[PDB]
Nucleic acid binder design. Structure first.
Length: 43
DNA sequence: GACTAGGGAGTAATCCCCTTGGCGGTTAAAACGCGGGGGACAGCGCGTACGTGCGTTTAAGCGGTGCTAGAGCTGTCTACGACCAATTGAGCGGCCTCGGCACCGGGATTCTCCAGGG
């Protein structure tokens, strides 16, 4: 249950950043560059 | 044309305020030490909550398919942004307050310890 909580607290952000990338991409399809760009900001 | 008179600069003396070192006096913070006690931790017991073996199924990968709506590039124009300065006012550079902040006292209030009995 705890690891379920931590994944719910991690993946929602690592897909919300991709959502913002799609918003600032005029693009309905997630691509590798956009998702990796939104992802690497974690560290 | 020859020499005369006066004042700010050239030379110089006065003042004098400004600091370099060392040394002594004195308060505050840091430095050191003890009695004792509360925090750290061993020894241990256990139970119950997982560590593990095996039966019996749903499900991701498998193997393939038929396309379908969103993504990349091809012109093309045109609304707009980076190119001089006048401006003139939005705002900063320097000064002068009295007020909120600084901070401590008298007191009410509150937080804590004990040796006993209750």
């Amino acid at each position: 249950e705890e690891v379920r909580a931590v994944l719910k607290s991690f993946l929602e952000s690592v897909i919300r950043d991709s959502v913002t990338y799609t918003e600032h991409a005029k693009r309905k399809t997630v691509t590798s560059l956009d998702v990796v760009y939104a992802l690497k900001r974690q560290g």
